Design a protein around this ligand. Sequence first.
Ligand SMILES: Nc1nc(-c2ccc(F)c(Cl)c2)c(-c2ccc3ncccc3n2)s1
Length: 431
Amino acid sequence: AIFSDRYKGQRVLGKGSFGEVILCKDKITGQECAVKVISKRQVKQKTDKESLLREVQLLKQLDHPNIMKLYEFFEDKGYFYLVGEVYTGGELFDEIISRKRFSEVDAARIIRQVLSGITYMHKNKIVHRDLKPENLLLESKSKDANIRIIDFGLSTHFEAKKMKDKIGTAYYIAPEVLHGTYDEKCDVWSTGVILYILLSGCPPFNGANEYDILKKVEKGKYTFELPQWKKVSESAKDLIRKMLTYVPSMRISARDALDHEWIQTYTKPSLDNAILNIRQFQGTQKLAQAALLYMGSKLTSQDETKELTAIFHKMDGDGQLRAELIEGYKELMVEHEVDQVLDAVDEYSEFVTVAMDRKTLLSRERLERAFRMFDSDNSGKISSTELATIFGVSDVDSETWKSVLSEVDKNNDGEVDFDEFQQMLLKLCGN
Ligand SMILES: Nc1nc(-c2ccc(F)c(Cl)c2)c(-c2ccc3ncccc3n2)s1
């Protein structure tokens, strides 16, 4: 069975763990599907091919309202295709940051759905291991919408260190996953971390960079000693303690977390400080991601323009080429789709300059949206202290970004506007 013989790509949906996610359409029935394309050369398999096929077959037969539905699985010489259901409500935290009010009832309603999904998958001997906010999608971008857990079962078969992929993962990993011996209790720990963030807006294990967060997770010590925890019930704190128990055999099960008094009481007072902190948290994570994407896209577009100029030169020394511009794009890469991308751009040098400038403007606009969102007081600038947090999350060395900051503007007074921030990212990816 061949994937392209059944589905056609419509548009990109986002970046997933182990691969890119494309919105596809069945060529006969018109059914829309989310397809994750895992490149075999950039991921690698940690199990035998027979074990993967067995897990996929089991996953296709499972059904729970809080677990993503997997429909199909294809494989060719260079890729794996995971075909499943489209959830259009966005990421859970992106919905929570838009709310004006959030309470323990809102938090418990969320955590009951995650724990229901997890309890079901653990009965079927499936472990997630990489449970995190990004893997919690909503069916609708609204309150009380159903939460679907994505990627439950892939970690056991695919190998995860590309920085843009690792960002936002160290907060949630169970300490025993770091040391190598782990079972289904690691999913309770990650849910405990998510619950701690929902009620305080701050991760229980934090640090200036990836390794500093992992050190805190490995020691496993945390506290409820922040002013915002004074406005939270002891029952919520008691559940978090059972969920963040260090020794996995002593940690509460997902089933026993659903039967905890906190879940049963609060799923039958606004946490204003928690909403303020979670916005700052999401903004920081999203600006670090956007910054790494921008740098990655600048190297990709620099490499592609060098490869594209060689293909278009060899095909000519007149210096001019409609039909040959189409053939050259397909050499680097639907004939109707390719024709339309070149018609939008409309001498091959001027065409290459217009097609590149169009990609550069769109790359600048995605980064700018994330910068604007991070700048919640609309000051137009981000401080040196905020740059340290952003570059810490994105794993850019301190002496390196401070040197680059000095080279962009010698008279920065510990702040950068958007244009200066963008200039610094260009210097950090060899431009
Ligand atoms: N890390 C991620 N993996 C996936 C994914 C997609 C297809 C699959 F078969 C599997 Cl196993 C996972 C994501 C996904 C899913 C639905 C979506 N629906 C609308 C928008 C984005 C979506 N992204 S995010």
